[PDB]
Copies of this chain bind each other. A is one copy, B any other.
Amino acid sequence: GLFGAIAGFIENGWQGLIDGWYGFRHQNAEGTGTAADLKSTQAAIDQINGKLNRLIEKTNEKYHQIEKEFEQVEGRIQDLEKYVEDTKIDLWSYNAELLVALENQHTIDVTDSEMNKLFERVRRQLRENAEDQGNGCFEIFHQCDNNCIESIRNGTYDHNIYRDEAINNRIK
């Protein structure tokens, strides 16, 4: 990937995460849990589906063509009819080989981006109340019960509420 989140500072993936492509995993006083994130998961699927629907549009429909199999040598005309078909098959085979190789390089870059998109969103939420450990986790320097955790996952967390507490626990 170009952003180095997936196969980067995010060591590995979570097989237990089955309801989404990206999710949270917390440790607070009350315990531990894992929940998927919809927005990030939705954006990634949209761009994969969006490029899957583009690749299926049925646009090849030919009926009368030239003969592509011969029972007797003929020479000039057959040499051309064979060369024309071979030249076509070569070009389409390259078009296909390049398309797949390119759509995959972009696909892996998009998913790597969406993982970084989610991480940067959370980073901007807490924004003085947490520090980047480096492995894709945030050390939250204040008490955060399950309601506080959900407020981070649904985007209602107010940093001004714990700012005094957090800065004190970080600096000292």
Which residues of A approach B to under 8 Å, CB–CB?
2-4, 8-9, 54, 60, 62, 64-66, 76-77, 79-81, 83-84, 86-88, 90-92, 94-95, 98-99, 101-102, 105-106, 109-110, 113, 117, 120-121, 124-125, 127-128, 131-134, 167, 170-171
Contact = CB atoms under 8 A, between A and B. Distances in A.
7 contacts: A2-B109, A4-B113, A64-B79, A124-B134, A127-B131, A167-B171, A171-B171
B171 A110 contact: no
B54 A66 contact: no
A133 B128 CA distance: 10
A94 B30 CA distance: 58
B98 A4 contact: no
Contacts of A90: 60
Contacts of A65: 79, 83
Contact of A95 (B64, B94, B170, B171): B94
A2, A64, A94, A131: residue with the most chain B Cβ atoms closer than 10 Å = A2
B9 A124 contact: yes
A79 B94 CA distance: 25
B4 A2 contact: no
A8, A64, A83: residue with the most chain B Cβ atoms closer than 10 Å = A83
B84 A87 contact: yes
A94 B54 CA distance: 12
A21 to B, nearest CB: 16
A-B interface, 5 closest residue pairs, ranked by CB to CB distance from nearest: A124-B134, A2-B113, A4-B117, A66-B83, A87-B88
